[PDB]
């Protein structure tokens, strides 16, 4: 799945994110923890305070993974193989949380790319994140 127009949308959009990718990844997590406190339960041994260097640190990891996904839109399963294992098998992350993080990410981008965040870009980004989430929750073995 994920159509050309979409892919093209994901590309320029993420293209615009450029080098803020890690600060956005961090802010996204921060917005997730604050809006949906149930999510904090997955990071018990993490300093979840505003400005935390752990969250800062994790934001970067998330961004890099999304970036890798952007560049492998035809091989998302291939590109995120490692991560589904971790999130599904090891962590046992409830699938609902993927939706919370995706929403928190959409809020963040919109927040930073008002001119670029058009209904169509918004629709493609939604589709994208949903595909990613689908991949990460694929291996509940």
């Amino acid at each position: 799945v994920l159509s050309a127009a979409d892919k093209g949308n994901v590309k320029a959009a993420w293209g615009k994110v450029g080098g803020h990718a890690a600060e956005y990844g961090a802010e996204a997590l921060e917005r997730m923890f604050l809006s949906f406190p149930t999510t904090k339960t997955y990071f018990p041994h993490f300093d979840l305070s505003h400005g935390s260097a752990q969250v800062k640190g994790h934001g970067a990891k998330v961004a890099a993974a999304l970036t890798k996904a952007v560049e492998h839109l035809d091989d998302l399963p291939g590109a995120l193989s490692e991560l589904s294992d971790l999130h599904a098998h090891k962590l046992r992350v409830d699938p609902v949380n993927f939706k919370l993080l995706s929403h928190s990410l959409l809020v963040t981008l919109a927040s930073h790319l008002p001119s670029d965040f058009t209904p169509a870009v918004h629709a493609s980004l939604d589709k994208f994140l949903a595909n990613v989430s689908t991949v990460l929750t694929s291996k509940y073995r």
Binding site: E30, S35, V107, S111, A123
Partner: protein, 145 residues
Amino acid sequence: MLTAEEKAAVTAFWGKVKVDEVGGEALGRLLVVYPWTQRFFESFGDLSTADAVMNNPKVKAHGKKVLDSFSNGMKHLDDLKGTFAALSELHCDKLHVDPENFKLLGNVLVVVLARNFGKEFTPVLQADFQKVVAGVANALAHRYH
């Protein structure tokens, strides 16, 4: 729900919201982002394209109405259930809108507040707003439970 501090925060911010602008944008993005929702507005006219949807006059007019109700709930944060009783009846009993869709619109509204206010739409403020929308979707799905 909203703590006294949370209501103060939400209430203070809301004053800067232009309901005409924000309402039309939110309804339009819902229709664009979650297509199945168009099923409910077939009479609004052309919804064929993103542009079709965003420039539709009925879409825009309807958005304002939706936002007005929001504003009203903002005035009665303690009794959204009562405040939305009539709308709950309309949406559930008459339209038969899956309650899951009330949540999608609430979420699109948050996205649209963020797009419009940038830096002022802080993680803290977003968090207070998530409570509001959850509160509203809940009052709307009343007659479902």
